[PDB]
């Protein structure tokens, strides 16, 4: 049971990373953690919660299905099975397979707000969170939305509060957003791994976890209030509007992804460029990162042997989109691999890589969020990397909780 120990190590890291340890609201953070693990057992181990989890996952499976239908229309056969039949795994085309679902969830989002549904669920859940852990209404709203909808799409509803909110609340939105898995990305993994309820629970663990680590860094200052044109006439107006918005957002995202991935490749090339000089060549950044996160890899309860690979994967997770990490991941889960699953390590890696710690997500959030409040730009971007580490640790804590329920 290195799990609790691991948790301690994590929180220790937070403190080390924390700006102010004296301002920490324990009534907030401890409660958050508590809630996270509580929900964890709730959906997973004890109280037959896997049932409502199942109905949920089913429902959402149908959602993703619908989006997939629309896409099947717009892009025709390029998303069909024949692509696999010819190209194989490469037949899976992320651009077509995933990014449009941003448009879908954006539209759906707008629709619900026109209906008043998201209003309700956000009001309720955010109400609860704010009640127990005492964080401000806004950040609660955001973290609430993050469960259902995606990080990309989330900031659309915090806009009246953005110019208003403090450094702290802002950083909370940033972090929670990063750690969140919903909407686009959810469907994304479903297209590949498809472990629906795992990702579900990952979301429900992510949001308050984000809240947790966000308050372990920039806990509190002052307070905030609500501040009130072009508004949707009918449901269709909404649908189309949110669709377009989501579209150009998606384009942005794509460009970003291409960029960063390519850049990291460039960095490999750099590393090799120095190494072959230095006589010691053929060195991969992947291995470097492996060594780097290795202790951390072990701490969470991953056996050493497996911890090497795991650490590599996590390095990739931070500096590259989670999907690449996933690629080499299943490259390990495929047979003929010296590494084993251990029937724990697999699970604990899985949850860990669910979120977005990728720098690309910084760029996205910080960018758009800057567009909504250009005066806060410098502030936002200052906190990007911190936020990465935070959300990272959120997914990681979720993974530790998984490690807990691995045994029996």
Ligand X SMILES: CCCCCCCCC(CCCCCCCC)(CO[C@@H]1O[C@H](CO)[C@@H](O[C@H]2O[C@H](CO)[C@@H](O)[C@H](O)[C@H]2O)[C@H](O)[C@H]1O)CO[C@@H]1O[C@H](CO)[C@@H](O[C@H]2O[C@H](CO)[C@@H](O)[C@H](O)[C@H]2O)[C@H](O)[C@H]1O
Q: Least Å distance between CB 66 and ligand X?
A: 13
The yes or no reply on residue 69 touching a copy of itself (CB under 8 A) is: yes
Ordered DSSP codes for 231-284: ---SHHHHHHHHHHHHHHHHHHHHHHHHHHHHHHHHHHHHHHHHHHHHT-----
Does residue 294 contact residue 314 with C-beta atoms inside 8 Å? no
The yes or no reply on residue 56 touching ligand X (CB under 6 A) is: yes
The yes or no reply on residue 271 touching ligand X (CB under 6 A) is: no
The yes or no reply on residue 58 touching ligand X (CB under 6 A) is: yes
**Pairwise CA distance, residues 78 & 74, whole Å:** 10
Gaps in the chain (C to N over 2.5 angstroms) fall after 228
Q: Which of residues 268-297 bind a copy of itself (CB under 8 A)?
A: 268-269
The yes or no reply on residue 55 touching ligand X (CB under 6 A) is: yes
Q: Least Å distance between CB 55 and ligand X?
A: 4
The yes or no reply on residue 337 touching a copy of itself (CB under 8 A) is: no
Q: Least Å distance between CB 257 and a copy of itself?
A: 6
Q: Which does 275 bind (CB under 5 to 8 A by kind): ligand X, a copy of itself, none?
A: none
Pick the closer one to a copy of itself by CB: 73 or 278.
73
Q: Which of 9, 13, 30, 252 binds a copy of itself (CB under 8 A)?
A: 252
Q: Which does 55 bind (CB under 5 to 8 A by kind): ligand X, a copy of itself, none?
A: ligand X
Pick the closer one to ligand X by CB: 56 or 252.
56
Q: Which of 75, 127, 193, 220 binds a copy of itself (CB under 8 A)?
A: 75
SS3 353: coil
Q: Which of 41, 121, 247, 288 binds a copy of itself (CB under 8 A)?
A: 247
Residue 164: partners with Cβ closer than 8 Å, 6 or more residues away: 138, 224, 225, 226, 227
Q: Least Å distance between CB 344 and ligand X?
A: 25
Q: Which does 15 bind (CB under 5 to 8 A by kind): ligand X, a copy of itself, none?
A: none
How many residues of this chain bind ligand X (CB under 6 A)?
Answer: 6
From residue 221 to residue 240, what is the string marking binding to a copy of itself with x (rule CB under 8 A)?
Answer: --------xx-xxxxxx-xx
Q: Which does 287 bind (CB under 5 to 8 A by kind): a copy of itself, ligand X, none?
A: none
Coarse DSSP helix, strand, coil percentages of the chain, rounded to the nearest 5 percent: 75, 0, 25
Buried-exposed string 90-108: b where 16+ CB fall within 10 A, e elsewhere: ebeeeeebbbbbbbbbbbb
The yes or no reply on residue 277 touching ligand X (CB under 6 A) is: no
Pick the closer one to a copy of itself by CB: 165 or 366.
366
Q: Which of residues 85-124 bind a copy of itself (CB under 8 A)?
A: 86-95, 100, 103-104, 106-108, 111
- Return the range that interacts with ligand X (CB under 6 A); candidates 52-60, 205-213, 277-285, 308-316: 52-60
Does residue 224 contact residue 173 with C-beta atoms inside 8 Å? no
Ordered DSSP codes for 279-301: T-----HHHHHHHHHHHHHHHTT
- Return the range that interacts with ligand X (CB under 6 A); candidates 33-41, 54-62, 85-93, 378-386: 54-62
The yes or no reply on residue 167 touching a copy of itself (CB under 8 A) is: no
C-alpha closest to that of 319 among 347, 366, 353: 353
Q: Which of 19, 59, 284, 305 binds ligand X (CB under 6 A)?
A: 59
C-alpha closest to that of 223 among 134, 154, 156, 123: 134
C-alpha closest to that of 36 among 177, 297, 182, 211: 211
The yes or no reply on residue 254 touching a copy of itself (CB under 8 A) is: yes
Name the residue with the smallest CB distance to ligand X: 59
Structural tokens at position 357: 């710690």
Q: Which of 151, 286, 321, 395 binds a copy of itself (CB under 8 A)?
A: 321
Q: For tokens 């990080």, what's the residue?
A: 151
Q: For tokens 């194989």, what's the residue?
A: 88
Q: Least Å distance between CB 408 and a copy of itself?
A: 34
**Continuous H helices in 134-179:** 137-148, 159-162, 167-179
Q: Least Å distance between CB 122 and ligand X?
A: 17
Residue 315: partners with Cβ closer than 8 Å, 6 or more residues away: 285, 286, 288, 289, 290, 292, 293
Q: Which of residues 180-219 bind ligand X (CB under 6 A)?
A: none
Binding residues vs ligand X (CB under 6 A):
52, 55-56, 58-59, 273
């Amino acid at each position: 049971l290195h799990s609790l120990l691991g948790m301690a190590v994590l929180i220790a890291i937070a403190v080390l990373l924390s700006t102010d340890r004296k301002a920490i609201n324990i009534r907030t953070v401890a409660g958050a953690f508590l809630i996270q693990v509580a929900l964890g057992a709730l959906v997973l181990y004890v109280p037959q919660g896997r049932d409502m989890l199942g109905e949920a996952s089913k429902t959402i499976s149908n959602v993703i299905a619908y989006g997939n239908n629309g896409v099947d229309f717009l892009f025709g056969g390029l998303v069909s099975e024949k692509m696999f039949e010819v190209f194989g795994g490469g037949g899976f085309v992320f651009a077509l397979r995933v990014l449009p679902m941003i448009v879908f969830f954006s539209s759906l989002m707008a629709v619900l707000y026109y209906i008043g549904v998201m209003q309700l669920l956000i009001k309720v859940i955010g109400g609860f969170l704010q009640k127990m852990l005492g964080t401000s209404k806004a950040e609660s709203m955001s973290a609430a939305a993050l469960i259902f909808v995606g990080q990309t799409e989330a900031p659309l509803v915090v806009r009246p509060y953005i110019r208003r909110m403090t450094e702290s609340e802002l950083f909370a939105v940033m972090s929670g957003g990063l750690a969140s898995v919903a909407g686009s990305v959810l469907a994304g993994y479903v297209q590949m791994g498809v472990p629906l309820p795992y990702l579900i629970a990952a979301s429900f663990m992510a949001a308050p976890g984000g809240l947790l680590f966000a308050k372990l860094l920039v806990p509190e200052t002052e307070r905030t209030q609500n501040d009130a044109d072009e508004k949707p006439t009918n449901v269709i107006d909404a649908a189309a509007s949110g669709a377009v918005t989501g579209a150009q957002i998606a384009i942005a995202v794509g460009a970003s992804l291409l960029a960063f991935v390519a850049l990291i490749a460039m960095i490999n090339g750099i590393i090799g460029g120095v190494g072959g000089w230095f006589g010691h060549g053929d060195l991969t950044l992947q291995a470097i990162l492996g060594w780097l996160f290795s202790p951390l890899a072990w701490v969470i309860g991953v056996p050493w042997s497996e911890a090497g690979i795991a650490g590599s994967l996590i390095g990739q997770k931070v500096v590259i989109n989670e999907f690449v990490a996933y690629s080499e991941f299943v490259k390990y889960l495929k047979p003929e691999a010296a590494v084993q699953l251990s029937d724990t390590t697999k699970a604990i890696i899985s949850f860990a890589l669910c979120g977005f710690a990728n720098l690309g997500s910084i760029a996205v959030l910080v960018g758009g969020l800057s567009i909504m409040a250009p005066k806060r730009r410098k502030d936002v971007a200052r906190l990007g990397i911190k936020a990465v580490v935070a959300g990272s640790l959120s997914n990681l804590m979720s993974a530790v909780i998984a490690g807990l329920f691995t045994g029996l």
